[PDB]
Point group: none
Chain length 195, copies 2
């Protein structure tokens, strides 16, 4: 099996409508991935090999592991902290390239050539089926995460009860010790006056 990530993007040439990007890989995005773009009517598909990823990461002076982290933020929709990414696609040449905006820099991150799919309806139906499967998967993870929260709250409740009983036993013992010291002081007086 593999892993996917379906994301919304807005093309620079078409800011009015929303496009959808589907990226799928095997174990890591670093070993290559298939990328599919659709507008709800047509679909375009491309493949990026591991060699192309290592080469594009080398055309720019950039550690390869760090470059994959930029692909994940750009193509897998993980760039929340005030990052600006742009996506460009010509439906006449099928050339897709994306850039990263900093301070009017807009430097190129990567690019690939897509191809118009002859069965867009089947690709779109497959995309909707994964979203529905991902919704059912994520609903069970909500219930499991809520159950883990209640299990931890009961473990915290037990830990607080045990700490309170621990304090109670410490109080009793230092009271016992202080009372024994008074008995010792009394017996030392009994010994002192028996002489």
């Amino acid at each position: 099996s593999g892993e996917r990530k379906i994301s919304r993007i807005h093309l620079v040439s078409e800011p009015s409508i929303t496009h959808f990007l589907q990226v799928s890989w095997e174990k890591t995005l670093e070993s290559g991935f298939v990328i599919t773009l659709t507008d709800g009517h047509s679909a375009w598909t491309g493949t990026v090999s591991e060699s192309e990823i290592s080469q594009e990461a080398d055309d720019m002076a950039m550690e390869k592991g760090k470059y994959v982290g930029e692909l994940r933020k750009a193509l897998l929709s993980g760039a929340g902290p005030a990052d600006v990414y742009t996506f460009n696609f010509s439906k006449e040449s099928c050339y897709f390239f994306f850039e990263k905006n900093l301070k009017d820099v807009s430097f190129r991150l990567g690019s690939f050539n897509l191809e118009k799919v002859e069965n867009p309806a089947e690709v779109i139906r497959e995309l909707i089926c994964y979203c529905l499967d991902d919704l059912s998967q994520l609903q069970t993870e909500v219930e499991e995460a809520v159950q883990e929260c209640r299990n931890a709250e009961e473990k915290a409740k037990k830990a607080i009860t045990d700490a309170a009983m621990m304090a109670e036993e410490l109080k009793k013992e230092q009271d016992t010790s202080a009372h024994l010291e008074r008995m010792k002081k009394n017996m030392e007086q009994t010994i002192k006056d028996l002489q």
Copy 2:
């Protein structure tokens, strides 16, 4: 205040292609809903009013509550293996009717009069956007539960650390008490020797 449910269905006339049924309503399903059917290329939409739902329950001689329960299982994917529902759609008439299947028989539960949407791509894009909105909301619900789980683990660690500190103090106090009772044993014996 609108709710929505998107389900995978298979039409009787097209078993090899998966269709999608989008049901949206406002207050309750009983008060009327909107149907959208798509195959990834085309889209058909229609509306069912509260009066038509009540009329369909009357046509089947059952109380509206039990009929709406059947609507919920057939149209909102609220059915298990004990309930089987089939779906029929003719692209020429745009007439959609669904049935319940028991043993070797089937009977009508309801129907919609759909119409082909002239801009299905916008309908399909809006449907996918909703699924991605729902995925993001469930993602935050996991992160909120995981965070509340971490908050409970921090309270436990503090209580465990506090208890362990008091546990070592208890042992120190117990050793002090045992030392005092040993002196208490010696002094009580020397007291009896001074008495004798």
